[PDB]
Amino acid sequence: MALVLLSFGVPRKAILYPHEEPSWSLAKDIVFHPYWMIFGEVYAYEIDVCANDSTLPTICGPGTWLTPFLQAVYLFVQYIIMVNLLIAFFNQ
């Protein structure tokens, strides 16, 4: 469940913030939001940052149409496959 988190957090922080000098924030923001997604916080007004309902209208740029797909793939793994593999673990 932590590979999948960084499988998703590294492409997204790369696709959305493509001017980042080296920083320690690149160690939180590849791990931060993808962890709070496991608990149902979808950051729905930060998907599709080019949309009109966005809290992030400044992050709109080339390639930022890819993150809705990556996240679709992400939660299907982190909320349906894997977090319900735990449930089946404990129950058995």
Ligand X SMILES: C[C@@H]1CC[C@@]2(OC1)O[C@H]1C[C@H]3[C@@H]4CC=C5C[C@@H](OCCC(CO)CO)CC[C@]5(C)[C@H]4CC[C@]3(C)[C@H]1[C@@H]2C
Q: How far apart are the first and last CA of the chain?
A: 20
Give the one residue of 4, 7, 11, 26 binding ligand X; rule: CB under 6 A.
26
Site residues (CB under 6 A) for ligand X, limited to 49-68: none
Whole-number Å distance between alpha carbons of 78 and 54:
24
User: Nearest approach, Cβ of 41 to ligand X (angstroms)?
Assistant: 21
Burial tier of 24 (Cβ tally within 10 Å: 0-12, 13-18, 19+): exposed
* Stretch of 2-10, 11-19, 67-75 lying at the interface with a copy of itself (CB under 8 A): 67-75
Residue 90's SS3 state is: helix
Q: Which residues bind a copy of itself (CB under 8 A)?
A: 32, 35-36, 38-44, 47-48, 53, 55, 68, 72, 75, 79-80, 83-88, 90-92
